């Protein structure tokens, strides 16, 4: 019996901390446990625990890279360059950086979710535009090995985080992915697809800017499959 655990918390009615773990009901008391002490300061928590029915297991394949650079303006031409590889035009990655470096809520500042791009034409094809599409139901089948291992392999808790999540978009349909988180003073990000694999570049921001987010380059065509898989379809990534 599996069960998705999951935990969102507020300051002020500014959100503050978000999790997710999907686990059996012997380490479902563990899960609880973690979330609830995982922000730092908060006035409201919820935490939902779900029975999960249907789900599936999937193997871990990327290759993971790394990438430095001197500014965020060579760090966004090579994730340019990167997303070209996985046949997007130009001016198509050019629009997602844009996006992403204006701030991608159209209220301004940051989506909670992720643009959905139309590979072809560049056009936003998700209907809140402040909102944008969460990618949720995912989580690394065996997290403690997981997260020891690459951790001590040189990456972060964000990176142990960030792949689960692009593995979990990759594996709904999505072609490729340009992130980068909205941390003010995190400015390593990355760009994934199949081909590509996972790919980090730092820094795609500058230091001390509270913007970030997500662009999912993705198929019009296939649209409505996707936003259900990323939505609904429960999935364990296996390293
Ligand atoms: N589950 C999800 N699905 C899709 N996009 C997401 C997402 N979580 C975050 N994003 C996008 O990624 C951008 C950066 O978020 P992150 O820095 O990676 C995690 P966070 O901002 O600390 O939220 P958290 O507190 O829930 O972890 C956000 O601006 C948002 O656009
Ligand atoms: O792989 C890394 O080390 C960078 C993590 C990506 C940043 C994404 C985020 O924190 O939102
Ligand atoms: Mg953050």
């Known amino acids: 019996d599996l069960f998705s655990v999951r935990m969102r918390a507020q300051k002020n009615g500014k959100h503050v901390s978000g999790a997710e773990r999907i686990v059996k009901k012997e380490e479902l008391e563990t899960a609880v446990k973690e979330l609830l002490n995982r922000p730092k300061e908060f006035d409201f928590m919820n935490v939902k625990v779900e029975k999960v029915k249907d789900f599936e297991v999937v193997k871990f394949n990327l290759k993971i890279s790394t990438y430095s650079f001197k500014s965020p303006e060579e760090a966004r031409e090579f994730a340019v360059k990167k997303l070209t590889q996985e046949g997007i035009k130009e001016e198509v990655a050019k629009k997602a950086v844009e996006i992403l470096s204006k701030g991608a809520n159209p209220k301004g500042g940051n989506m909670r979710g992720a643009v959905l791009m139309d590979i072809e034409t560049g056009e936003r094809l998700e209907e809140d535009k402040e909102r944008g599409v969460r990618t949720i139901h995912f989580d690394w089948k065996d997290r403690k090995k997981v997260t020891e291992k690459l951790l001590?392999?040189?990456?972060?808790?964000?990176?142990?985080?960030?792949?689960?999540?692009?593995?979990?978009?990759?594996?709904?349909?999505?072609?490729?992915?340009?992130?980068?988180?909205?941390?003010?003073?995190?400015?390593?990000?990355?760009?994934?697809?199949?081909?590509?694999?996972?790919?980090?570049?730092?820094?795609?921001?500058e230091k001390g800017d509270p913007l970030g987010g997500r662009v999912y380059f993705v198929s019009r065509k296939e649209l409505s499959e996707i936003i259900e898989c990323l939505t609904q379809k429960v999935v364990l990534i296996e390293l």
Request: glycine fraction near 10%.
């Open 152 to 205: 001590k392999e040189g990456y972060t808790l964000r990176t142990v985080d960030a792949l689960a999540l692009t593995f979990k978009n990759l594996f709904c349909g999505v072609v490729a992915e340009l992130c980068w988180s909205d941390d003010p003073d995190y400015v390593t990000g990355y760009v994934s697809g199949k081909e590509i694999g996972y790919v980090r570049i730092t820094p795609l921001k």
